[PDB]
Ligand binder design. Structure first.
Ligand SMILES: Cc1cc2nc3c(=O)[nH]c(=O)nc-3n(C[C@H](O)[C@H](O)[C@H](O)COP(=O)(O)O)c2cc1C
Ligand code: SF4
Lengths: 429, 56
């Protein structure tokens, strides 16, 4: 296969993505969920992990780390501490609104994924840390979990397979930093949501000081479908090392802002036009696109013209797939203002633990505000680039790196606008 | 200097040189003690980029 992005409804994992069916157990089972889960569990943890590896599933939370290997990290003889699994449901990345759809409209799919993953990693129970703002989604998830408990799908002797597994939901309290895996672990443990410093890796020491694995909602939810339909099925979609189907949260200056499940390695322009109706005012009216949430650097229209929405291709484009939250910006958009707003978001969502993040992010926000007003000098742009480089790679968590990347992208692609704005501001005074 | 022409001639002849051309006493060629406020420049390392101290 050389031309990707032709995903069929027969190949879409999330069938109730738009909530047009029954999110409850009846609808989920009617759509193929919770099917032969006992056989899946009895197949063997090694078998499940092998199926995940065959599918080539990579982290759908944004990291892109091979999911099979990451889950295999915890498939070791028990050290005496009760192994646990954590499903990341915070979804705090600006532009990312997929996990919400999965939880609110196909919660039972996620619950089955939790059961299968826990069996694959020998986890006692699963804690799904959902964002506190997602109260109604959490209510839906809890109803689904209750239905599963009553039906015997989860709990002791889950699906009549003998595996004793539990699914817990922990509501957040409004912190984007909690999206980070170790910060999520700390938040669950009751401390402030400040990320840990690896090592120790979460697989070894995690929630309650026990072997723990943190996985994205989509990453977990696709596991049962990967097992049932075979790893080859998931691998068939997408290029090698970029296989599968990724939810694309197209947002911003698009005619039809929506979330659509499309095959990986899909051309960006196609994806924008195929589902979102194209850029408002036409393709030529596009200014730039942020492919993955906000952390990933922006790509100008020139690159956006011909680029595949997959991990490797976007990495070549000085960006990343991330959460695949395509933020379309038309030419009526002050790119400086948008990037400054993202930097302000990072400033207001910084844990404050690491010195580079705590101070540098605020410094960058100040400089970005001055750039938005044009109250600066051309050398300050290079100074800002150096500040971003200093922050990146020198922080405990990747929030600092994911805040340096937008500034770097803005400079690297639209430095002329910054310089021209400074010139205009100088002329005014 | 405020000297009579005769005194000037006698002085120059005794010295053998035109002393009035180069009088040791300073009268008006002195620079004004009150001067315009200066603006001293900055050094080569007064830059906001490529200024890491490890390279200097
Ligand atoms: C600042 C920050 C915010 C994050 N937010 C999220 C998030 O909202 N949802 C998510 O799944 N992962 C988020 N992550 C990534 C997590 O740390 C972790 O890698 C991820 O939940 C695991 O995804 P995976 O197992 O599918 O690879 C965030 C990471 C950072 C540094
Ligand atoms: S780059 Fe940070 S001061 Fe940070 S562990 Fe952080 S939200 Fe941080």
């Amino acid at each position: 296969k050389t031309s990707f992005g032709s995903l069929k409804d027969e190949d879409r994992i999330f069938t109730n993505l738009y909530g047009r069916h029954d999110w409850r157990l009846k609808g989920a089972q009617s759509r193929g969920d919770w099917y032969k889960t006992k056989e899946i569990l009895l197949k063997g943890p090694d078998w499940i992990l092998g199926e995940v590896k065959t599918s080539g599933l990579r982290g759908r939370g944004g990291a892109g780390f091979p999911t099979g290997l990451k889950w295999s990290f915890m498939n070791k003889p028990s050290d005496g501490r009760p192994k646990y699994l954590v499903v990341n449901a915070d979804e705090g990345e600006p532009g990312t609104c997929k996990d919400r759809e999965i939880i609110r409209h196909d919660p039972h799919k996620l619950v089955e994924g939790c059961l299968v993953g826990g069996r694959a990693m020998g986890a006692r129970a699963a804690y799904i840390y959902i964002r506190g703002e997602f109260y109604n989604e959490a209510s839906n998830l809890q109803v689904a979990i209750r239905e599963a408990y009553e039906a015997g799908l989860i709990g002791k002797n889950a699906c009549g397979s003998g595996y004793d597994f539990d699914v817990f939901v922990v509501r957040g309290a409004g912190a984007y930093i909690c999206g980070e895996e170790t910060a999520l672990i700390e938040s669950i443990e009751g401390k402030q949501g400040k990320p840990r410093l690896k090592p120790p890796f979460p697989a070894d020491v995690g929630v309650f000081g026990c072997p723990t694995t943190v996985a994205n909602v989509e990453t977990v939810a696709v596991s049962p479908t990967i097992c049932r339909r075979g790893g080859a099925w998931f691998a068939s979609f997408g290029r090698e090392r970029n296989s599968g189907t990724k939810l694309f949260n197209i947002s911003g200056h698009v005619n039809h802002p929506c979330t659509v499940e499309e095959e990986m390695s899909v051309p960006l322009k196609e994806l924008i036009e195929k589902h979102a109706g194209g850029v408002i005012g036409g393709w030529d009216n596009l200014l730039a696109v942020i492919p993955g949430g906000s952390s990933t650097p922006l790509i100008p229209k020139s690159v956006c013209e011909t680029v595949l929405m997959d991990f490797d291709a976007l990495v070549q484009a000085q960006t990343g797939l991330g959460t695949a939250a395509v933020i379309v910006m038309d030419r009526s958009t002050d790119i400086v203002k948008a990037i400054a707003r993202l930097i302000e978001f990072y400033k207001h969502e910084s844990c404050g633990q690491c010195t580079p993040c705590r101070e540098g992010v605020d410094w960058m926000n100040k400089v970005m505000a001055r750039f938005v007003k044009g109250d600066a000098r051309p050398a300050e742009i290079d100074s800002l680039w150096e500040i971003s480089k200093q922050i990146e790679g020198h922080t405990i968590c990747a929030l600092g790196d994911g805040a340096a990347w937008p500034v770097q992208g803005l400079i690297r692609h639209f430095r002329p606008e910054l310089e021209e704005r400074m010139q205009q501001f100088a002329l005014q005074h | 200097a405020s000297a009579t022409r005769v005194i000037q001639l006698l002085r120059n002849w005794a010295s053998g040189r035109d002393l009035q051309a180069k009088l040791q006493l300073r009268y008006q060629e002195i620079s004004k003690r009150t001067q315009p406020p200066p603006k001293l420049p900055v050094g080569p390392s007064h830059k906001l980029s490529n200024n890491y101290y490890c390279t200097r």
